[PDB]
Design an enzyme around this catalytic site. Structure first.
Site, PDB file in Angstrom:
ATOM      1  N   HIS A   1       0.835  -1.190   0.000  1.00 24.55           N
ATOM      2  CA  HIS A   1       0.000   0.000   0.000  1.00 24.55           C
ATOM      3  C   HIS A   1       0.865   1.233   0.000  1.00 24.55           C
ATOM      4  O   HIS A   1       0.360   2.360  -0.125  1.00 24.55           O
ATOM      5  CB  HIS A   1      -0.755   0.150   1.310  1.00 24.55           C
TER       6      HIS A   1
ATOM      7  N   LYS B   1     -16.415   5.739  -1.581  1.00 25.98           N
ATOM      8  CA  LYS B   1     -17.534   6.003  -0.711  1.00 25.98           C
ATOM      9  C   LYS B   1     -18.314   7.245  -1.106  1.00 25.98           C
ATOM     10  O   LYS B   1     -19.483   7.279  -0.963  1.00 25.98           O
ATOM     11  CB  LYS B   1     -17.104   6.083   0.760  1.00 25.98           C
TER      12      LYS B   1
ATOM     13  N   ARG C   1      -6.914  11.891   5.928  1.00 27.08           N
ATOM     14  CA  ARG C   1      -5.847  12.293   6.835  1.00 27.08           C
ATOM     15  C   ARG C   1      -5.091  13.476   6.191  1.00 27.08           C
ATOM     16  O   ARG C   1      -5.067  13.615   4.953  1.00 27.08           O
ATOM     17  CB  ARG C   1      -4.934  11.113   7.171  1.00 27.08           C
TER      18      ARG C   1
HETATM   19  C1  LIG Z   1     -12.112   5.676   4.243  1.00 24.77           C
HETATM   20  O1  LIG Z   1     -11.438   4.864   3.606  1.00 24.77           O
HETATM   21  C2  LIG Z   1     -11.542   6.441   5.399  1.00 24.77           C
HETATM   22  C3  LIG Z   1     -10.273   6.965   5.236  1.00 24.77           C
HETATM   23  C4  LIG Z   1      -9.584   6.805   3.910  1.00 24.77           C
HETATM   24  O2  LIG Z   1      -9.973   7.849   3.053  1.00 24.77           O
HETATM   25  P1  LIG Z   1      -9.003   8.299   1.833  1.00 24.77           P
HETATM   26  O3  LIG Z   1      -9.207   7.160   0.848  1.00 24.77           O
HETATM   27  O4  LIG Z   1      -7.582   8.523   2.254  1.00 24.77           O
HETATM   28  O5  LIG Z   1      -9.411   9.633   1.275  1.00 24.77           O
HETATM   29  C5  LIG Z   1      -9.747   7.784   6.231  1.00 24.77           C
HETATM   30  N1  LIG Z   1     -10.493   8.059   7.377  1.00 24.77           N
HETATM   31  C6  LIG Z   1     -11.759   7.514   7.535  1.00 24.77           C
HETATM   32  C7  LIG Z   1     -12.535   7.808   8.769  1.00 24.77           C
HETATM   33  C8  LIG Z   1     -12.306   6.695   6.549  1.00 24.77           C
HETATM   34  O6  LIG Z   1     -13.663   6.425   6.571  1.00 24.77           O
HETATM   35  C1  LIG Z   2       0.241   3.166   3.880  1.00 30.95           C
HETATM   36  C2  LIG Z   2      -1.214   3.410   3.611  1.00 30.95           C
HETATM   37  O1  LIG Z   2      -2.005   3.676   4.501  1.00 30.95           O
HETATM   38  N1  LIG Z   2      -1.588   3.316   2.337  1.00 30.95           N
HETATM   39  C3  LIG Z   2      -2.970   3.493   1.938  1.00 30.95           C
HETATM   40  O2  LIG Z   2      -3.583   2.217   1.764  1.00 30.95           O
HETATM   41  C4  LIG Z   2      -4.978   2.332   1.490  1.00 30.95           C
HETATM   42  C5  LIG Z   2      -5.609   0.946   1.474  1.00 30.95           C
HETATM   43  O3  LIG Z   2      -5.200   0.248   0.292  1.00 30.95           O
HETATM   44  C6  LIG Z   2      -5.176   3.037   0.153  1.00 30.95           C
HETATM   45  O4  LIG Z   2      -6.575   3.218  -0.088  1.00 30.95           O
HETATM   46  C7  LIG Z   2      -4.479   4.393   0.142  1.00 30.95           C
HETATM   47  O5  LIG Z   2      -4.488   4.923  -1.188  1.00 30.95           O
HETATM   48  C8  LIG Z   2      -3.040   4.272   0.630  1.00 30.95           C
HETATM   49  O6  LIG Z   2      -2.490   5.579   0.824  1.00 30.95           O
END
Ligand SMILES: *C(=O)c1c(COP(=O)(O)O)cnc(C)c1O
Ligand SMILES: CC(=O)N[C@@H]1O[C@H](CO)[C@@H](O)[C@H](O)[C@H]1O
Ligand SMILES: O=C(NC(=O)c1cc(F)c(F)cc1Cl)Nc1ccc(C(=O)O)cc1OC(F)(F)F
Ligand SMILES: O=C(NC(=O)c1cc(F)c(F)cc1Cl)Nc1ccc(C(=O)O)cc1OC(F)(F)F
Ligand SMILES: *C(=O)c1c(COP(=O)(O)O)cnc(C)c1O
Ligand SMILES: CC(=O)N[C@@H]1O[C@H](CO)[C@@H](O)[C@H](O)[C@H]1O
Lengths: 794, 794
Positions: free
Chosen positions: A340, A643, A532
């Site tokens: 990831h 989402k 984040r």
């Molecule tokens: C959902 O996946 C989620 C994330 C990740 O979102 P991004 O794909 O980085 O934009 C981060 N925080 C919460 C609470 C989620 O529901």
């Molecule tokens: C290290 C880490 O949190 N990587 C994250 O992994 C998530 C789950 O695959 C991806 O959706 C995202 O793009 C990526 O930034």
């Protein structure tokens, strides 16, 4: 039925809470209802696990330092078909269900997408009825709570377990020793790890109910305890140090911080999990170990649980007395690795001194793994000296560190990225050296989200609507949402869809107005960036466009301006300085923007505090515009994007991560895609990025920068935001200015589409209708079929 | 009846433990029964607590750092009258009832006499239907678990909570802030106590079932937590320090250890408690605190919570803004103090330095009290310059200390001792300066035990037998034991009583041999001494007698020896060096004696590992001779003594504590009294103690001492007991030698009588039938009438 749920409720309030209505707290009620709902999954929970033991299907073990779970109560009702009856029972007792639901702490055992991926997957695997387990750490403190004080993020311990948790059952019989430190003897009975310090691992089981089937799988989180034999008062106090291991989740998003406690966390969860798996396999029907990989799959959730490879080997060789070659055939065949991580600083590399002092045996085994590895490379490439140090697990220069990725790659039979484009770079570029050697090992599995939590639960309006058109099959097969295409010309369906959006807006507008005392224009565009905070995600760039919108009002106040409510949210890691600055900038802007009487209700900016699973469920269904604007190449896949798409928002973003697959599915015409693609980024690194050039070239950008740097947003520290300015001009890896114009131009297209309800909602429906790929149900089929090799059952 | 109990047990096993029969563990079963039993008191608990809310009678708060509760399950069954039916239900399900019961942890939250007094008190206030509450600390770790290793004491942490506790219900809604450190500010709104660090206090309720009536009273125990608000990981790890306040119980019996943390514990419980009482008071139907003392009594279980006095004042003055004079009249009326000790080294005496750092406001309030105190001594004794320093709360040498006993005296309407001799000495000697001024302040309240845990529970045999003969009303009015006098004629009876005691020595003998390497003679005289290991309690004087005896078989292996199992048990404070050696000795002696084949079965010596409440419930009913042999004037009361009286043993002991009163009750010819009375010890001190005189003077002692010193009991290290011997000749404040002769001759008569089945049991009967005074029920009426001024309703 209702009357019985009501009798259960009262029984729990009475016996479990020792309360009668007279002095029952809202918490008393929450608890009573939780216990009532939890009682309704026990039988299936036993029967499921019983069936696994009786029929021995191949079990999937998802191994992770993070499970971003959110609240259980409502998700659980929904998946039991109980929500409506509970709603009614609670209503009839003169209570408000949404009020009780509000009591529950999030299980915030996660940072973001990586941890939330784990959560969706468990829901998905239970719904497809796989024999699956979640394994991780029961952190006493999940991701910290975020207050904002003077427009600055402030950390408060996420004390999530203070009042108790009725969604976990401890398992006193499955406690395990875990070992640390000590030394290695290579006696003539096998090699032996001795004189170690011992931590105990107490497991807690949480029910993972499937969506309307008979499956309830398990999530088993481990807790740290001191042993009894490894100043008297101080000695007892000192037991704190052992129990410190499962104490607090590391709050870093996409950043490696080589801390010792963290290394301990990682072995801790690996060690207890691996014992439990062997124990279970051994207690079952089935070198009786030859069947292990026909009965066990362990998905490494990034490199965090990387020690699981040298640990399995440790167990196989030293205890099980298998010959190394065998142990290794089986290790390879058990593990799979999910990559990831994208940026240099997120890469886990552990210092050798540290791995030696804390885990000598693992070190030895890692070296051994490395020898066997570099041997084979020499054999196929004898004049190639650089390919050696390049593919070595040991980064031999100076410090000397273990490259945990390299370890995962060699110990696993499958390696995967999380979106097409990403797996692609991973395979052809980042791991050219390894993939050349075994192309077939490297695959993609594009990410997914559960449409239970992310449609059904967070958005029942839409769920009902869709269901009233095409029936409910879509929940378990989201590809069925294409059936909606046949409603494109349906003028009345479009109104019902817009109504649904507007109720989500109205409700959420209440939330914003009652939590921030800020007048919400209910009909403005809800333009939302929640994730984040990290420079790569580029909240900053959004922030710049906010400033541009504000100025545009100022210069020409009578000019037609499409009102937006702009929402930015998410947590910054406590040590991530620049991220904290980027927060202070936003809250600063909001202060100016929200109080400038000349703008009034045309522009309102909210920075959204304490962003987390249960808040995502509130804000997402209420969104018109999803900001998804990382620099290309920097976002592995993303899941928020998905989402938003499913919940009736239009997406504005770059050709990066899964955004790309969203565009394929719904067609680019139907997204607001802009910016440099990866090539455009490389070409600019090649020629050389001069941030300056764009600041001179674009007059609106020039003003925004000037405003920020000369304290227009900070009259008491006119040069408060200097660090942002330097980075922007001299050290901006993410090329904020290079994408500005394209972005703003693209922003103006969204604005114009927004003034045409019919066109806008038509694009919405073409998005929702194509969102089906993104069900985590599809993702799991793919993992099941080409990696774990387990079949769905029912 | 039984059928409902079987259903309930199964509903718990299924829904609460998540197990079916074929995989349930033993713990599982225990919990299932435990929960079932709790359910069955819930109704009586809500009603008892409602009813106080209704009629609103005066409330008794017993505030103690210590509650030595032991196990709950069976006590609860008996008192709730459900032992019969529960036994059946468990039986009919094919489960071993007593194997279940053995899973339960001792709630071991006391050191001994003091904390057990509180535990008996609870049972009796509930049995008498008083509106009473116990307040203490929910210590994470009770008194340590003692392991004998190579004849030494090793301590293990008592992790009683690790599997959870079915008997407590957390009350999160009544959580509170306690304050520490910071500094005093004298502004013109008054004194503000500022920049304080806050610790959270979280209460937990345990049901206290009265015996066969409707009353279920409460025991509230407090746990420390960090607050909400604050290197982020390190900040989070550091929450550990706030929680350390309620982590472990200090393990000193009759000894003052002036550690800062302990002071914190003391403040913590006083602060939470006093707030919670105020809260309850204001919440009831009574800025008006005039009726406070009519609504509330608070007993100070020794000086430990002394701090309550200046806390109540502080609350009253600083927060409630009442005038000092009024605020003060109210305090004396609220509080009452029970002095439990006379050893100079056991008196709590806090360095002002420490108190000034930790509780700077409390220091002031104490000064301010002392001042007002000392003023009115000048009014009546204008030339007694010494009287003042003799009566000030502050001891003024080098680094000044706070005499907490004096504090409690000035701040309470009643000061009482725990037995006639103790109270008498407390009144006329130790605090003569004070008692002279308010003679009526000082009283006696003679200790007692509950005939529930210590009769019906532990010795069902004896209680069965008594009930057969005199009805079963003795359980609620003990004094009815006098009735058993009719039976002095009856040999059928006398033989029936002997049966019971023999049956216990059998049960007990089986457990005993299945523990230690030792051949137990089950009809030898069981010579039991159990209590915390103390120079003062004189387990040494017992050890000397044991050697003596052994030396009388080595001298004459063919002379008639009345055979006896000598059992000595107790925990030594970890920091108490003499007591540790003294244990070591008894085990050495044990190893020599049990392995002289010549002595064979005439004399076994057992050191009883890990003496604690549930162990006491086993050994006591199995005892013939009870060692109560403290130097006259040292044991304020004793309560072991009473338990052994109740349970059919005869006493060998000095004229100390309640011994005097047991003698009083049964007739002095019916106990084996011996050795120096109070004045004898007084005499010998003025004459001067000269230990070597008895060593020269007494041949049989002389051998014993030479064996010890020359290493007859430590061959491989003939040096071992250096310090025991040294202490005994130039330091023994408890004059072991001065009673050596009286003691052995005394033992010789016990031996003489044990050869007379008939006369012996006639004395045993004379003991049991006159033990009625010692029911804690009688003790409680007396506090109820004369201290608390409350009424025995139900
Ligand atoms: C959902 O996946 C989620 C994330 C990740 O979102 P991004 O794909 O980085 O934009 C981060 N925080 C919460 C609470 C989620 O529901
Ligand atoms: C290290 C880490 O949190 N990587 C994250 O992994 C998530 C789950 O695959 C991806 O959706 C995202 O793009 C990526 O930034
Ligand atoms: O009764 C159970 N309970 C659980 O397993 C359980 C226990 C928990 F504390 C928990 F938190 C969650 C669960 Cl799901 N299981 C079971 C029943 C019957 C059998 C048989 O083989 O007859 C085997 C069984 O164990 C297994 F796990 F194999 F099913
Ligand atoms: O419902 C209750 N529960 C308890 O008191 C309780 C709660 C616990 F968590 C526990 F562990 C033990 C108990 Cl005993 N009490 C109650 C009922 C009715 C009334 C009325 O006034 O109608 C007032 C009441 O409260 C009070 F405190 F007065 F008893
Ligand atoms: C019994 O009272 C008790 C004590 C105190 O007995 P003493 O009066 O000191 O002889 C200490 N420990 C336990 C377990 C008791 O039950
Ligand atoms: C301070 C302390 O532990 N004192 C002990 O208190 C108990 C109970 O009051 C008495 O039985 C005992 O004689 C006395 O020594």
């Amino acid at each position: 039925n209702v009357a019985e749920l009501k009798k259960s409720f009262n029984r729990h309030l009475h016996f479990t809470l020792v309360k009668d209505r007279n002095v029952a707290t809202t918490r008393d009620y929450y608890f009573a209802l939780a216990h009532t709902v939890r009682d309704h999954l026990v039988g299936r929970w036993i029967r499921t696990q019983q069936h696994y033991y009786d029929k021995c299907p191949k079990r999937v073990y998802y191994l992770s330092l993070e499970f971003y779970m959110g609240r259980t109560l409502q998700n659980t009702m929904i998946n039991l078909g109980l929500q409506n009856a509970c709603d009614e029972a609670i209503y009839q007792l003169g209570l408000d269900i949404e009020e009780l639901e509000e009591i529950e702490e999030d299980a915030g055992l996660g940072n973001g997408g990586l941890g939330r991926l784990a959560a969706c997957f468990l829901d998905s695997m239970a719904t497809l009825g796989l024999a699956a387990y979640g394994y991780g750490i029961r952190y006493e403190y999940g991701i910290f709570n975020q207050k904002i004080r003077d427009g600055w993020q402030v950390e408060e311990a996420d004390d999530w377990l203070r009042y108790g948790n009725p969604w976990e059952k401890s398992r006193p019989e499955f406690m395990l020793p875990v070992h640390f430190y000590g030394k290695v003897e290579h006696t003539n009975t096998g090699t032996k790890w001795i004189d170690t310090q011992v931590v105990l691992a107490l497991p807690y089981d949480t029910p993972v109910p499937g969506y309307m089937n008979n499956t309830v799988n398990t999530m088993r989180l481990w807790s740290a305890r001191a042993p009894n034999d490894f100043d008297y008062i101080q000695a007892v106090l000192d037991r704190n140090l052992a129990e410190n291991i499962s104490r607090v989740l590391y709050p870093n998003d996409n950043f490696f911080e080589g801390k010792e406690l963290r290394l301990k966390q990682e072995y801790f969860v690996v060690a207890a999990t691996l014992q439990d798996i062997i124990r279970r396999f051994k207690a079952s029907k089935f070198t009786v170990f030859d069947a292990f990989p026909d009965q066990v799959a362990i998905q490494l959730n990034d490199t965090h649980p990387a020690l699981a490879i040298p640990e399995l080997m440790r167990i196989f060789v030293d205890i099980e007395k298998l010959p190394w070659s065998k142990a290794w055939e089986l290790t390879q065949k058990t593990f799979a690795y999910t990559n990831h991580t994208v940026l240099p600083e997120a890469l886990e590399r552990w210092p050798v001194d540290l791995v030696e002092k804390l885990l000598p045996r693992h070190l030895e085994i890692i070296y051994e793994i490395n020898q066997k590895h570099l041997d084979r490379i020499v054999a196929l490439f004898p004049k190639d000296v650089d390919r050696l140090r390049r593919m070595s697990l040991i980064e031999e220069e100076g410090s000397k560190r273990i490259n945990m990725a390299h370890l995962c790659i060699v110990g696993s039979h499958a390696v995967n990225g999380v979106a097409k484009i990403h797996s692609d770079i991973v395979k052809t570029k980042v791991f050219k050296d390894f993939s050349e050697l075994e192309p077939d090992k490297f695959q993609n599995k594009t990410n997914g989200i559960t449409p239970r939590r992310w449609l059904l639960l967070c958005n029942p309006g839409l769920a009902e609507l869709i269901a009233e058109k095409i029936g409910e099959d879509y929940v378990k097969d989201l590809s069925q949402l294409t059936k909606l295409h046949s409603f494109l010309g349906d003028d009345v369906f479009l109104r019902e869809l817009a109504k649904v959006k507007q109720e989500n807006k109205l409700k959420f507008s209440q939330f914003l107005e009652t939590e921030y005392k800020v007048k919400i224009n209910p009909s403005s565009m809800f333009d939302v960036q929640v994730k984040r905070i990290h420079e790569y995600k580029r909240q900053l760039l959004n922030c710049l466009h906010v400033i541009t919108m504000y100025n545009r009002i100022k210069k020409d106040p009578k000019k037609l301006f499409v009102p937006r409510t702009v929402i930015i949210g998410g947590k910054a890691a406590p040590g991530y300085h620049m991220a904290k600055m980027i927060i202070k900038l936003i809250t600063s802007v909001a202060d100016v923007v929200n109080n400038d009487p000349m703008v009034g209700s045309k522009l309102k900016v909210i920075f959204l505090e304490n962003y987390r699973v249960s808040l995502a469920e509130k804000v997402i269904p209420a969104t018109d515009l999803s900001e998804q604007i990382s620099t290309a190449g920097t976002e592995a896949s993303g899941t928020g994007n998905m989402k938003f798409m499913l919940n009736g928002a239009l997406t504005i973003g770059t050709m990066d991560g899964a955004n790309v697959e969203m565009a394929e599915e719904a067609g680019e015409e139907n997204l607001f895609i802009f910016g440099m693609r990866i090539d455009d980024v490389a070409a600019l690194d090649k020629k050389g990025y001069e941030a300056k050039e764009y600041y001179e070239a674009l007059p609106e950008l020039k003003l925004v920068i000037d405003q920020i740097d000369n304290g227009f947003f900070s009259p008491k520290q006119p040069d408060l935001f200097k660090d942002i300015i330097n980075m922007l001009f001299y050290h901006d890896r993410f090329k904020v200015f290079a994408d500005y114009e394209a972005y703003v131009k693209c922003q103006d297209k969204v604005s114009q589409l927004y003034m045409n309800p019919k066109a806008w909602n038509t694009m919405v429906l073409k998005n929702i209708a194509a969102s089906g790929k993104f069900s985590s149900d599809r993702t799991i089929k793919e993992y099941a079929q080409n990696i774990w090799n387990v079949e769905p059952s029912d």
